[PDB]
Amino acid sequence: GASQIVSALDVIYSPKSNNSQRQEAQKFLDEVKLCSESPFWGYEIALQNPTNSILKYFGLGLLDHAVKKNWNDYDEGKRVALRKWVMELNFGVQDYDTRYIKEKLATLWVEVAKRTWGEALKQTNPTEEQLLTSWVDMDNNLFELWNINQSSRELALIIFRILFEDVFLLDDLIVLKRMTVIQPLCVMIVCPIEVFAIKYKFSDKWTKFKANEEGWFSVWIPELNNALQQNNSEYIIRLLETLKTCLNWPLTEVIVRNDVLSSLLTCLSSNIPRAQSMALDSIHILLTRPYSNESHYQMTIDRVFDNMDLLDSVYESLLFDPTDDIDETKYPIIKKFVDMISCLYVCVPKIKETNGQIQKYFKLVLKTTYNPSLIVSGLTLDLWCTCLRNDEYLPKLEKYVIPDLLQFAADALVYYEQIDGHISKKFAEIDFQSKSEFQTFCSTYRKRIRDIIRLISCVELDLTYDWLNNRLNNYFSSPFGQQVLSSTFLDHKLEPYLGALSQYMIVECFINGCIRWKIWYPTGDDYDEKLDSILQKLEILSNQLIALNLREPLLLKKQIQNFALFLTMLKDNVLFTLLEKIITSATMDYPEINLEERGAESDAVRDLRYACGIELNRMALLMPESLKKIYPDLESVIARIMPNLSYHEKISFKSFLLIIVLKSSLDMKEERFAAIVDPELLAWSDKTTVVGLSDLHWFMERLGIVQIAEYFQRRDIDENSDLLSIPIDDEGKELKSELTKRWQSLFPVRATRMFIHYSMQSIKTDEEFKMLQDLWRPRIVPILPYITRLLYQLQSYHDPDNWKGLPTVVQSFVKYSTIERFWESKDEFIDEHMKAMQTLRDFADSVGHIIRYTREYTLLVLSAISSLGSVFYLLDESPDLLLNSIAIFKPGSNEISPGVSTHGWKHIMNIAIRPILKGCPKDCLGKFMPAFLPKLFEILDLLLCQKWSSHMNDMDMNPVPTDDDQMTEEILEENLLRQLTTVVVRIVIDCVGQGNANPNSAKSRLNNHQMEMRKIIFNDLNTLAPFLKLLNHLISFKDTKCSFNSILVMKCCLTSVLNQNNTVDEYFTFEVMKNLLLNVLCNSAFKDSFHEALYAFTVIFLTLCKEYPSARAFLFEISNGYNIDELYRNLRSVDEYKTQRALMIDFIDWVKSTSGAGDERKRQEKREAILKKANERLIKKNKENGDML
Template sequence: MVWVNSTSMRDARCVETYYRYLAIPDLSLQTAAVEALTAFYERMYSHKVFDADTDLLEMIRYLLRSDNLAVLRDVYNWSLVDIYDLDHAKYILSKKLTEFLSIIGGHVWQRFRLTPENTELQAFYAILMEVLNNPSLVVSIPVLHFWAKHLKSRDLQVTDVLLQCFPPLLQSCSQRLFRYEALPEDSNEPTVLFLHEDIDTVPEKHAFLGNYRRYCLEVIEAITHSRPYDAIPHILSQSEQLFQERLYQDQPNFRAETFSRDSIPVLRADAQVTVVEAAVKGYLNWVAESEANGEHDNTPQKQLQSDLEQWCGRFMDMQFEDPEIRRKVIQLFATFATKAFHAEPDFALRLAGYLLSMNIIDDPNIPRYSEAVQNLESGRATELQRLAVMFPDYFLAHYDSFERRIYEILGRSGAIARQQWSYRAFLFIIILRSTTLDENTRQARLHDSMSLVREAWQTPELTELLSTFPGFCNYIGLGQLPEFFLAHRFPEVDDWPMHQLDTIAQAEQTAIVERLEKSPLRMTKSLLAASTEKLRESAQTYRTASALWGDAIPAILPNLLKLISHAQAFNDMTSWSHLPSELQMVMERVLTDRFWQAGISNESRDEFYARVSGSRSSMEGFASTVRGTARQVREQCYQILYGMTKLREQFYGYKELPEPLAQALFSNAHALSAHHLSILLSVSISIVDGCPAQFRARFLPPLLTSLFAQIDRKISSEWEVINRRTREAAEDDDLGDEMKAESILRNLTWTAVNFVSSLLSAQPQSFTPDSSPGGASKGLSMRSFIVSDPSVLEPLILFCTHALRVHDSRCCTLICRVLRDMIPDFTSSVPPAPQVREFISKEVLMACITSLNDAYFVELQKDLAQLIGAILLLYGSRTNTVRAVLLALPGMTEKKVDLATARIYGTKNERQQRALVLDLLKLIRGVSIHEAGRIERPDPRKARSAMQQRFMEVEQPPPAARTKSPDLGGVADMFGAGE
């Protein structure tokens, strides 16, 4: 080999020496050699050596020599272990070796075109494929991550070597999409046993498996994107074979009595459906890219679509008794119809006929099976609506046939009451959105449905019941709760999940659920969504929908707002203060949610769901029905409000609405828990963001004033609870619940802080653009509107001030930036600038200094100092308050303050200003807290590298686009009766 300089020669000798050690059959030497090689090539990555670097290429060539590859293969094969007779030292070597291989793979890939023809790329990739199929997912994930990362790179050059890798990659990734966490703990599956060996906590296991599946999906998408005509037939053939021949292989045939959401056939079906969906996504990416590059060829694409349609047709002829499998297959068909076949109405019509002709048989005597059937029914109705939105004109020709079939379904014995309006919405969508129907006929057909909505909200009985909180409880079937709890001994029983309800109590539980279904909420929500979802505001259909709901909105809102207010007050313990103390304790327990949190809960989401569902007939199940009923009322009301915001002027132009809306949404909001308040905040953000510019000054002040007052109150009090728990932590504390509570609070705080940032952004991003004539030109920008309105500005700045003390680095950093951007707005003498300036000069400055003194904020001292510097620079000469605050600090003198202030005035460099502030306040700055005492040495068998640790953590998804509907499922999904 030719080495350019002495350093390169030294590096070369090191690599050669490590390889000699690697070839010696000594476990400790081999492990040390792998560690050294890994560190060496990681260092080359960190130095960002360019492709043309001769030294690096020589070292890559050296590694790819056939004799060196043979050493790597031999060491890997020798390190393979049997989980039933585990050699821990070998297993550690195996994990370290696969990390090294993934790093080398990255080097090879980045310099692919510069690698000589005679290198053994095929042999190297063959080793990677062997590693990928290792029964230990922890061993294989570094290599899987390598494939996922590099296959989706834009500069991918598909060569014959890569093409040979695609089939085994598809095969491996398809198999590894199986949800291993759903298998029982005592499973003898080697992969599950390896997971038990490598990962101690359930949250880490869920995070790891989530990452593993995501990488598998990325590989499948990338391969399909690169070679759709090869990959898709291969995947479809695999899927058809599985569903026809291997779904129940080594498993008993389906029986409703033994139904399980996590049965092996369901898990196999779920994995394969996920594979096909990933393939469709990759195919659509290829189509979009081809069209953008002008390389689109309709002939092969049409042939591929024809093959896909035939494949779907064969699936429609298959019979699946398991409702969970049928639901997953329906979702797959809908993906094809609405994405891959978006221009093929014939397939959509065929799918609609298939959905409506499905014979779904329920059996209420088998709760788990019955619940799955209800989910299937819900999925069927949802997919029908999606099809109707895309093909209304085509479906109109078959409207009479659809209508007959739907009334047959609704009239069937045992039909699910809650789904009737989902099916009616399907018909409603066809009529409303058809462009071939004349307007008079359309209005006539839609009139009956809208009349039902208006009449349901204006009944004297409803208005009378909603006039008081007890009346509201009677309306939703919860008026006799205290008497029920006493009669069924709720105060006397501690273990509610284990205590089964008698037949009378179960009948009462069913009556509560049915009572809610008779309310106009679901009807209104379904038809409103059918009228507004995915409608362009410039379309004639939107104008029709707007006129249709114009008369209904004033009829709905009065009682809707009362429902919201009462449903929130239901969670306020002061609403139950008249009850005896033992019943107050029962109500407090009833209102305590059970929820699941990704990465924290010690069970999978499905396990949590099964546990909650399994306790439905117990006392805990009744409690879940009670709190779930109030929650559903709230969230369905929120969804109705969100739907109304899409009608713009019909909603925001309602002059009597702002004050009552603010009162309904926030007068009892303090009673909601953090995750329920997150849902309210989400819909509130949608309402604010959707407000046309010309309505802001009249509509938003009451809403924003109340919103920030309640958010500030809740977030500040909850963080105080978290901080107190931290200070008073004890060994017997339930850390799982505390972690979930803190995680939810962090998400709530971040959502609120991010909302403030977007409101005050120079170019705010709205959920939707202004639809009004003239758009944003008709009125102040959102930032100008807020800064000029003291009623809104005061609670907003107060919230920002308190957020500076929140123990969340991400939130504090963003608030520092928001406040820095605001400071220049208040340098004038025009009100409210002087008043705001005084507040910032005192309260905000004091909050910054307090945080600067807090050890938690050590990493944020630069952000805090920069904010303090901005206050000194812009306000120091305009008010004496800044100087007074600084002089009140211990150890501070006038000379020191004046000198630092003069230096800050004398420089325009922000970095220098920050340094001067930190020097001025060096005596009060906090220092990082290091753990004292003996540090426990971890078990070397459980020790993890940095790469392994990354795979055990939940990766944060990118922020959701603000054009989406608000997620009313909450930060942590709730499950229970009626939910």
């Protein structure tokens, strides 16, 4: 019997065992694991050997394994015997028992209860026999265990914690099968009898499961208070551990009666760190729990606000000096406190002011926001953003809360990433595991500070303007800011430039906040008087800023970018001065430095010129009417600078001129439009380009790869020689400059995109749209085939097989050109300047950069052409030309455009396909969709199947946060593939429509596009079959968000495809349902999307099985002998889906079981992680409200 197990365990742990004995024993004990008498042996060994910790743990593990796998087929006698064994084992807990053995005993107790407790409730008058089988004495036995020993009391607390965690937080399959019985019992045990009867459906049979009528909250709370009086730290920790899980779900009446909030506040003041964190989490849970007794909600909020002074003292104790090192013992407590304080802003309006409770609370938030750590400071920024936006809170925080917050935000609007001495880096190195993650969080924090400053400027415009003028005047008069005013170039990573950039950022935020004042302020008679005065102040500020005469390129860039914001209010008052300043800024020369060189300081001038051009374009786009007055003068002035502003600014200025021609109301619109667009678009119709566009060798020659071979031969470069360690000759620089200059002129892709986009940007009325279509029709139509040919050639460039005929010397160069370097800027602080030119490897890198630039611009050109509308969606060439160029098919195999990385596909999906699909007009959907949707869906499905198949079983479910060891190409490729899958899921969502979560309604808000697209897709099987094939793969693919969204989309589309055609049901019978049940429902890694997938599978099974008897044989074959026919008749008896969920869960459990050392730590870690995730979901209730795309 158990003697063999004892001998094997002694052998496996004997020091004389070695490899010989542990094979002898470990195999033997694993055999005992599957034996029928395993639970009896495990119970026997644990009771007989209490001193041996590991041996008793092994017996308890055997008993747990027996109750988790062999429990299903056990009869009533075996079940009751196992329950009695667990009961006896738990009651024998003594002092010498360790902590984890008590946890195992608690888990054993809970597992038995979940499968037996309350089973007799479903039958009216269950008599005495069912009561014994249903464990009617669960509460009484727990009460008996409560007063046996202190260790017994701790075991009871752990049992309660584990039971309440599984039922209400983890929501496992066993609880989900019997939720409607388990949850009322859980409410019963804690709440008193008289409280339960009023709220619930309490009957005579229910009261038999309760031991004490007072409830359990009448025992824990006095115990917690008594422990607080005696300062027993260890007991308080366990009591709070139980309370933090038991305080969410139960009724509010018992919580109010027992004064749990008072006990939590009392234990908050204690010196125990862990107890403070537990109390804070419990209070935060209590604040955000649902309240069906809003009258009871008043005292809970009032109690916290009345103790606002005590909360401040707690934060003061938690604060620590980070100069030496952080204190990880209490640092998370600070974050929890900050989150709990930030949550409280919702209940502010429902507080009666008696002792400045609201005033005290807002001061506490302001003090919290001053925390040196970035995370806790940013946790309260969303509070100020929401609080300032609402007009109700303004009179409350108007007193000495606004100026301090504004000053703090202005002082904190700095670049934390680059400054070395900032204290935030110490917290960054512990809270953020990646430099890129810290940079992204810093950018988000700076954006939120921007929003705060804008809101402050809008709310308190007079005071904010006065303070800003006082600060700006003082800063430039300081002996530290005058360096900027008297310097040409400055270090873009040092303090003197950063401070001035921050000041200009603050000025930009203030100006942006003045625009919102136009809408926020009411339209009363004072609107005209106030607005006139503000415009004078803005004009004075603009004149003062201009008079500074800045010269630093990047700072002048920021000042020029600020000019567009000024024009919104000043309008014609300042337009002439701004136009004069911008024009001379781009033309301004820098004789001290030659602009031909690609130095870091030289790139600033180019960036400033680009910004000036784009700002001129935006200024023209804003309003052309006043620009028409000086149109001849502007034309002459700009033509005077034609030979000097290079090609880029030439295109920018031509586009600027084109805006005035179209948007304004001058004469000869056609002639002026043709005078500018035609010279730039002429290169598209070149005879040499047209003929050579179909030949890849001509494309290579024009790119200059063959010309590079001559340079390599002259330099005597070998193909096998490494290109990373070869210096660049001065001839190479000239060759690169010549090639990049000729390439842009050969394909005027940039000019076409800007021209079309700005011509079709602001289209007032409807007659203007018709005229503009007639203008672009003779031009775009003969050029679209050439654009598609160029895109196809560029896509075929990435193919390794294409360049086989190229010279062998430049083969390695071309291979190095194709790789997308290491790809994973909207804030003005980050500066990159795209490095410099050092080695021959960078020559391949820059050629690839040119290739990707051309591809991105041709995608933008295609999107802009799609923005035209009828002229592009009507011709029969467009549906076929676009798809042929996007994806190519080699004569052999089925690879879709071999040689292009995932990132390129992600961009060509998110740049061209999205606007083309979304931009189709209602009248044009009937002609473009039938010739475009099927091939596109087939291409997407095949590509997604191919890309994911390379490493199908080689990831984890959730993305892994990258770090210093995680720039491995596998991780980056995985992230890019996930992003591409998300992009195609968004494509499907925008195309057809996504459903809601388990809470159902009358479908989603399918406004206008989705109705038209659903009619085309669903009524055409030729388009429906590829779409259904694509959708199945999306669900089958291993990802969290994409699978959930695909399942929701399938549920939305489930009720309109299941009976239209016979062929559709054939695919559903064999492919969709089999994949859903076997690869999603059966798989244990899809727990996040289990509920929606289960519901979709149920809806599929119900309708399909009704009319297809042949499907039942398939289900019988898949499920391995399950009575499918019995399932159909059993389910049809109950109309409610909630009852059928238990039946489907039981059916799935059969399929999973039939098709089914470090394990202990792995399961424990997984349970801890999912418990933490559930706690976060509960805490952020009404803020998260689920996650979708």
